[PDB]
Each structure stands twice: as structure tokens, then as C-alpha cells.
């Protein structure tokens with residue numbers, strides 16, 4: 001299902017057995033769908049014959065490359081099946097080894113006879129704020145089955161097995177996103193795209209000519225200053241970690257689904273690493289950081305035939321610089337860094353700048369979910385959580 005009426009007509013054999021609300025039910029309650037089980041299965045779940053569990057050591061360069069290759073060739077595509085994500089090995093270490101990562105949560109599936117990696121799912125620890133509750137959860141990401149093993153019910157085994165391994169660590173709630181509709185979305189978001197290199201975006205058919213426009217007029221439409229306007233703007237440095245933590249923590253209080261990051265987590269997620277994560281702060285006249293913007297790097301391979309370099313807005317905190325100016329500088333910085341497109345969701349306060357800043361709304365939805373938690377749904381503007 002891609003919309004909820006698609007999901008209105010479908011049977012959920014696996015998800016009906018899971019502690020998540022039914023799609024049809026209207027939810028007002030707050031808390032777990034079920035009580036925690038205090039004795040947990042020690043044995044890993046049975047895979048189909050010919051397949052075996054292997055926890056992937058991503059500190060081993062060969063195993064990280066095995067994982068990269070699986071995701072490069074089998075992970076999320078667009079709705080039109082024209083572009084596939086091209087996660088780099090250094091991005092995967094960033095996304096998969098934040099503070100608190102556990103090796104048993106890098107859960108791969110291999111072919112027994114050849115040891116070929118054919119499946120994967122991951123959990124990372126995350127302190128999550130949902131409405132008035134702050135709880136330790138896991139973020140689930142990179143669920144992936146090889147194309148040659150699709151529609152053999154392997155995905156429910158991966159979900160059950162990462163659940164069991166998370167339960168063993170005493171965690172009973174999880175958060176995750178998906179482009180398909182399942183029981184049951186807590187929030188719904190849409191991707192918006194801001195062209196920065198419109199010629200390239202049209203040759204690879206990511207974008208197309210508006211009616212009677214011309215490349216020369218479209219390039220004119222999306223032109224940017226190429227030197228940012230805000231004074232005091234500069235890359236984040238080690239000395240900025242405490243204030244960036246401070247700024248983010250207070251900014252996120254206005255949203256209903258937010259992460260709660262320690263100072264070490266703020267360092268991991270925001271300290272710049274070239275081709276992975278970019279963060280820029282705005283220092284004022286008296287030397288105090290008052291704003292910062294962030295976006296991460298995720299290229300997309302062109303499926304028909306190298307890649308489209310895409311920036312994704314991460315967390316943007318404004319206390320003195322107007323958010324529109326802050327995001328305008330982010331577009332400039334992305335274009336100086338060679339990015340062809342700048343993506344962002346309609347969550348947090350992004351709606352206040354998306355149209356003004358020439359973003360075009362894209363196709364497909366991004367659903368947010370909680371596992372084993374009852375809460376009312378919320379609008380995109382209330383979601384304050386971005387996952388990689």
C-alpha cells in the first residue's frame with residue numbers, strides 16, 4: 001500500500017500479529033500496546049533453509065563493502081524505479097555506529113553455501129520524546145532483502161529477529177519510517193525538492209521542462225547568490241558542540257516526536273565529515289552561536305545507466321536568524337559544494353519556507369511509525385525527527 005485506501009483493501013498477515021494499532025481503529029490512548037515480556041527467546045528465529053544469521057562487523061572493511069554492495073543493488077528505489085540510493089561505506093558507519101550501537105544489532109542474512117550477504121536489518125539506540133513521554137527506544141533502518149529473495153516472507157523473520165535482540169537489551173519500543181503504508185502511521189510527511197543544478201536534473205530525467213519554459217529560463221528561475229548572506233556563518237567546530245546541543249535541545253521542545261540527544265550524540269550526528277554530514281553555525285558579534293543548519297550527503301545512482309548528488313535537510317535551529325534566511329544560505333552552501341538537488345520534508349517548521357524557497361513537492365509519502373506505543377496521530381509540522 002502506498003496510500004491509506006490502498007491499505008484499506010489489504011490483509012496484513014504479519015502486522016496483525018504485532019503490537020501496533022490497527023489501521024482502521026481511531027487511537028486515543030497513551031502507552032504500550034502490550035506489557036513487556038520478562039522472559040525472552042534465547043534461540044534466533046528460524047530462517048528458510050539455505051540461509052543463516054550473521055552479525056556484520058562494520059569495522060571490517062570487507063564486511064562493510066559487502067553491506068554497501070547489498071544496499072547499492074537492492075535497497076530503496078523511487079516510485080518510478082529510476083534512481084536508487086548510493087550509500088557510501090563512510091555514511092553507513094556514520095548512520096550505523098552512533099553512541100550506543102551494538103554489534104548484534106547489525107543483523108545480516110547470508111546464504112549458507114556461499115556466504116553471500118542477501119539480507120539486513122539494523123537497530124540503533126535512541127532516546128525518544130513522544131508527546132509527554134521520554135523513553136529509550138531503537139531506530140530501525142536499512143531493512144533490505146536481495147531482489148532474488150523478494151516475496152518469500154523473509155522480511156517478517158528479520159523484523160522478528162531484530163525485535164528479539166532488542167528485547168534482550170530491555171527495550172520494548174521502536175521508531176521507524178517507510179514509504180509504504182502499514183499499521184499504523186503516527187505521522188505523514190512528503191519530500192520536497194529544490195533544484196540547484198537544473199540542467200543536470202533534466203538530462204537524467206529527475207525533473208522535466210515546465211510548459212513553455214526552456215532550460216535557459218529554468219536555470220534563471222533557480223539561480224542562487226553563491227555567497228551566503230548571513231554574517232557569522234561558518235562550519236561547526238569542536239568548540240561549538242556544547243552550544244549546538246543546547247540550541248537543539250530547546251528548539252525540539254515545540255514538537256511532539258523528537259529525539260533527545262546527549263552531548264556525545266550531538267557530536268556524532270552533527271560534527272562535519274566531508275561527503276557525509278555538513279553543519280554550519282551562525283556566530284553573532286559577541287561570539288555566541290545563535291543558529292545552525294545541517295544537511296547530509298546521499299547520492300542516488302541513475303538506474304537507466306554517475307550519480308545525482310543530493311543534500312537532505314537534517315536539523316535547522318533558528319533563534320536570531322530568520323529560518324527563511326537560514327535555509328536560503330543552506331541552499332547556497334549546498335550549491336557551492338556541488339550538490340545538484342536539496343531535499344527536505346514538510347515536518348517541523350519547514351512548510352514556512354518550502355514554497356517561498358522554490359521547493360517543488362515530490363511524489364510518494366514518508367510514514368512515521370512507533371512500535372508498541374499508543375499515541376494520537378500528529379501533523380507533519382509536529383514531527384521533529386529526521387532519520388537517515
Ligand SMILES: CCCCCCCCCCCCCC(=O)SCCNC(=O)CCNC(=O)[C@H](O)C(C)(C)COP(=O)(O)OP(=O)(O)OC[C@H]1O[C@@H](n2cnc3c(N)ncnc32)[C@H](O)[C@@H]1OP(=O)(O)O
Pocket residue numbers: 011012013014015016074075076077138140141142143144145146149150151152153154155156159162163166167171172173174176177178179180182371372
Ligand atoms: C522493540 C523493537 C522492535 C523492532 C522492530 C520494529 C518494527 C520494524 C519494522 C521494519 C522497519 C523497516 C524500516 C526501513 O528500513 S524502510 C525501507 C524498506 N526497505 C526497502 O524498501 C528496500 C527495498 N525492499 C526490500 O528489500 C523488500 O521489499 C522489503 C525488505 C522491504 C520487504 O520484503 P519483501 O518485499 O520480500 O516482502 P516479504 O514477502 O518478505 O514480506 C512481506 C511482509 O512484510 C511487510 N513489509 C513490507 N515492506 C515493509 C517495510 N518496508 N517495513 C515493514 N514491513 C514491511 C509486508 O507488508 C508484509 O507484511 P504483511 O502485509 O504480511 O503484514
